[PDB]
Amino acid sequence: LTEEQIAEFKEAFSLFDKDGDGTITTKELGTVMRSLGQNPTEAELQDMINEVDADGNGTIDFPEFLTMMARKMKDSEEEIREAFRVFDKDGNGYISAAELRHVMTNLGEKLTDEEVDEMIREADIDGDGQVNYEEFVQMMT
Amino acid sequence: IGAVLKVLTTGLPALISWIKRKR
Ligand SMILES: [Ca+2]
Ligand SMILES: [Ca+2]
Ligand SMILES: [Ca+2]
Ligand SMILES: [Ca+2]
């Protein structure tokens, strides 16, 4: 495990734990899903927790979250296209800096413009300054 | 449903943290 991986895992956890109490509840999961245009039922959310709820306490702590993500990584093409469409708001096939800014603003991450442009440069493979579907695939896998 | 999970647990965090750790 590298120093790099830990910061990434931390930021991903903090995305969900919007109140910062160090646990992820069904309500936080639902709120994050709805901010991305999804609509999960209470049963689906509980099943999502209980698929990783090692201690049976009804919330997700840090290592259970790691288990959830590692399981999900091992898991699909319909889903990847769905997320792409989550970001390609106007459907032109290229994720722009403006679209990523909009998504970040929806998630609650207060990121500067220069930082979003940095994210685009980091994910951009062909160097056109946008993220196409294939670059998105590369990012996921 | 699982798509949003895959997105918010695989690619996006790497970028956000790789840009945030530079400060
Ligand atoms: Ca919480
Ligand atoms: Ca638990
Ligand atoms: Ca677009
Ligand atoms: Ca590109």
Tab-separated table of C-alpha atoms and ligand atoms in Angstrom:
chain	number	residue	atom	x	y	z
A	1	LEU	CA	0.000	0.000	0.000
A	2	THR	CA	1.359	3.394	-1.065
A	3	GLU	CA	1.039	6.908	0.350
A	4	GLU	CA	-0.809	7.782	-2.873
A	5	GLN	CA	-3.520	5.131	-2.378
A	6	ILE	CA	-4.315	6.320	1.162
A	7	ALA	CA	-5.139	9.929	0.192
A	8	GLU	CA	-7.381	8.633	-2.623
A	9	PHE	CA	-9.187	6.247	-0.276
A	10	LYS	CA	-9.599	9.060	2.264
A	11	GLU	CA	-11.133	11.485	-0.225
A	12	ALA	CA	-13.496	8.793	-1.494
A	13	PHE	CA	-14.677	8.033	2.046
A	14	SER	CA	-15.156	11.727	2.857
A	15	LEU	CA	-17.289	12.183	-0.268
A	16	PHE	CA	-19.952	9.932	1.327
A	17	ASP	CA	-19.480	10.950	4.984
A	18	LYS	CA	-20.887	14.406	4.311
A	19	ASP	CA	-21.387	15.138	8.008
A	20	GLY	CA	-17.860	13.917	8.810
A	21	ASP	CA	-18.684	11.705	11.806
A	22	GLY	CA	-16.529	8.880	10.445
A	23	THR	CA	-19.447	6.574	9.600
A	24	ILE	CA	-21.578	6.263	6.462
A	25	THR	CA	-25.319	5.784	7.079
A	26	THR	CA	-28.084	4.637	4.736
A	27	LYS	CA	-29.228	8.269	4.563
A	28	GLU	CA	-25.842	9.566	3.395
A	29	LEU	CA	-25.677	6.814	0.759
A	30	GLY	CA	-29.150	7.755	-0.470
A	31	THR	CA	-28.320	11.463	-0.522
A	32	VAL	CA	-25.179	10.904	-2.582
A	33	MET	CA	-27.021	8.573	-4.974
A	34	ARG	CA	-29.852	11.077	-5.521
A	35	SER	CA	-27.400	13.910	-6.140
A	36	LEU	CA	-26.178	11.753	-9.064
A	37	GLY	CA	-29.685	11.211	-10.465
A	38	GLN	CA	-30.210	7.759	-8.939
A	39	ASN	CA	-33.156	6.728	-6.741
A	40	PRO	CA	-32.411	3.803	-4.386
A	41	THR	CA	-35.060	2.360	-2.093
A	42	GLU	CA	-34.557	1.900	1.653
A	43	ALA	CA	-34.218	-1.870	1.137
A	44	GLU	CA	-31.549	-1.456	-1.542
A	45	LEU	CA	-29.585	0.904	0.716
A	46	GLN	CA	-29.735	-1.462	3.695
A	47	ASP	CA	-28.676	-4.363	1.461
A	48	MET	CA	-25.764	-2.195	0.293
A	49	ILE	CA	-24.605	-1.696	3.883
A	50	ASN	CA	-25.256	-5.293	4.981
A	51	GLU	CA	-23.186	-6.553	2.039
A	52	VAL	CA	-20.154	-5.147	3.896
A	53	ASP	CA	-21.432	-4.605	7.455
A	54	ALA	CA	-18.875	-6.869	9.116
A	55	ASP	CA	-19.803	-5.855	12.679
A	56	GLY	CA	-23.574	-5.740	12.141
A	57	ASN	CA	-23.762	-2.206	13.543
A	58	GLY	CA	-25.862	-0.811	10.674
A	59	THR	CA	-23.359	1.798	9.440
A	60	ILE	CA	-20.196	1.649	7.338
A	61	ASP	CA	-16.851	2.430	8.939
A	62	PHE	CA	-13.565	2.861	7.057
A	63	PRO	CA	-12.436	-0.790	6.520
A	64	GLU	CA	-15.942	-1.936	5.574
A	65	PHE	CA	-15.943	0.850	2.996
A	66	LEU	CA	-12.607	-0.442	1.708
A	67	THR	CA	-14.186	-3.897	1.385
A	68	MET	CA	-17.157	-2.421	-0.516
A	69	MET	CA	-14.878	-0.607	-2.956
A	70	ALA	CA	-12.566	-3.580	-3.535
A	71	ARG	CA	-15.604	-5.780	-4.217
A	72	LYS	CA	-16.972	-3.151	-6.622
A	73	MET	CA	-13.626	-2.827	-8.421
A	74	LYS	CA	-13.618	-6.581	-9.093
A	75	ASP	CA	-17.077	-6.094	-10.655
A	76	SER	CA	-19.937	-4.354	-16.440
A	77	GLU	CA	-20.265	-1.918	-19.357
A	78	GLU	CA	-23.823	-0.692	-18.863
A	79	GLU	CA	-22.795	0.827	-15.531
A	80	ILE	CA	-19.708	2.538	-16.941
A	81	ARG	CA	-21.762	4.066	-19.767
A	82	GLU	CA	-24.355	5.187	-17.185
A	83	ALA	CA	-21.713	7.013	-15.129
A	84	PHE	CA	-20.246	8.541	-18.277
A	85	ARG	CA	-23.700	9.911	-19.078
A	86	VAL	CA	-23.829	11.162	-15.472
A	87	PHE	CA	-20.918	13.434	-16.367
A	88	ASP	CA	-21.537	14.089	-20.079
A	89	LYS	CA	-24.535	16.282	-19.263
A	90	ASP	CA	-25.072	17.449	-22.853
A	91	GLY	CA	-24.361	14.032	-24.383
A	92	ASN	CA	-21.707	15.165	-26.850
A	93	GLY	CA	-19.302	12.373	-25.824
A	94	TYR	CA	-16.693	14.604	-24.133
A	95	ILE	CA	-16.574	15.474	-20.432
A	96	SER	CA	-15.548	19.123	-20.158
A	97	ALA	CA	-14.057	21.042	-17.236
A	98	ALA	CA	-17.399	22.844	-16.820
A	99	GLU	CA	-19.271	19.531	-16.552
A	100	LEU	CA	-16.829	18.203	-13.956
A	101	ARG	CA	-17.173	21.464	-12.008
A	102	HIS	CA	-20.967	21.053	-12.071
A	103	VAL	CA	-20.726	17.468	-10.807
A	104	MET	CA	-18.297	18.468	-8.036
A	105	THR	CA	-20.658	21.279	-7.016
A	106	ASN	CA	-23.500	18.739	-6.868
A	107	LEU	CA	-21.427	16.435	-4.643
A	108	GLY	CA	-20.348	19.245	-2.292
A	109	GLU	CA	-16.608	19.201	-3.059
A	110	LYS	CA	-15.438	22.832	-3.011
A	111	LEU	CA	-12.677	22.638	-5.628
A	112	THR	CA	-11.001	25.590	-7.318
A	113	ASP	CA	-11.175	25.999	-11.095
A	114	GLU	CA	-7.423	25.471	-11.521
A	115	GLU	CA	-7.820	22.242	-9.549
A	116	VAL	CA	-10.643	20.983	-11.790
A	117	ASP	CA	-8.555	21.814	-14.871
A	118	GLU	CA	-5.734	19.864	-13.223
A	119	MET	CA	-8.095	16.902	-12.810
A	120	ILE	CA	-8.996	17.096	-16.507
A	121	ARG	CA	-5.326	17.209	-17.527
A	122	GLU	CA	-4.588	14.240	-15.233
A	123	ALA	CA	-7.377	12.113	-16.724
A	124	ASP	CA	-6.967	13.330	-20.330
A	125	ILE	CA	-4.981	10.812	-22.405
A	126	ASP	CA	-5.102	12.159	-25.972
A	127	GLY	CA	-4.408	15.738	-24.843
A	128	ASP	CA	-7.444	17.481	-26.363
A	129	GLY	CA	-8.370	18.796	-22.915
A	130	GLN	CA	-11.552	16.720	-22.579
A	131	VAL	CA	-12.394	13.211	-21.354
A	132	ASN	CA	-13.913	10.952	-24.018
A	133	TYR	CA	-15.602	7.623	-23.253
A	134	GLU	CA	-12.446	5.561	-23.780
A	135	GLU	CA	-10.366	7.755	-21.456
A	136	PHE	CA	-13.191	7.356	-18.935
A	137	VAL	CA	-12.938	3.564	-19.328
A	138	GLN	CA	-9.191	3.808	-18.685
A	139	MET	CA	-9.875	5.892	-15.561
A	140	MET	CA	-12.230	3.225	-14.196
A	141	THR	CA	-10.037	0.214	-14.968
B	1	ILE	CA	-27.198	2.077	-8.743
B	2	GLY	CA	-23.980	0.074	-8.665
B	3	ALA	CA	-22.741	2.330	-11.469
B	4	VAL	CA	-22.585	5.342	-9.143
B	5	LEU	CA	-20.777	3.152	-6.609
B	6	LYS	CA	-18.186	2.074	-9.183
B	7	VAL	CA	-17.734	5.700	-10.274
B	8	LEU	CA	-17.405	7.165	-6.767
B	9	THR	CA	-15.090	4.328	-5.645
B	10	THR	CA	-12.670	3.821	-8.570
B	11	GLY	CA	-11.760	6.744	-10.847
B	12	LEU	CA	-12.994	10.068	-9.431
B	13	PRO	CA	-11.304	9.668	-5.990
B	14	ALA	CA	-7.884	9.082	-7.546
B	15	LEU	CA	-8.118	12.372	-9.462
B	16	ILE	CA	-9.616	14.419	-6.617
B	17	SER	CA	-6.980	13.282	-4.122
B	18	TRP	CA	-4.100	13.473	-6.621
B	19	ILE	CA	-4.995	17.119	-7.191
B	20	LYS	CA	-5.705	17.811	-3.498
B	21	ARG	CA	-2.427	16.372	-2.165
B	22	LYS	CA	-0.614	19.061	-4.210
B	23	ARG	CA	-0.877	22.013	-1.833
C	1	CA	CA	-21.906	10.162	8.436
C	2	CA	CA	-20.392	-1.884	10.166
C	3	CA	CA	-20.219	16.976	-22.666
C	4	CA	CA	-9.100	13.652	-24.348
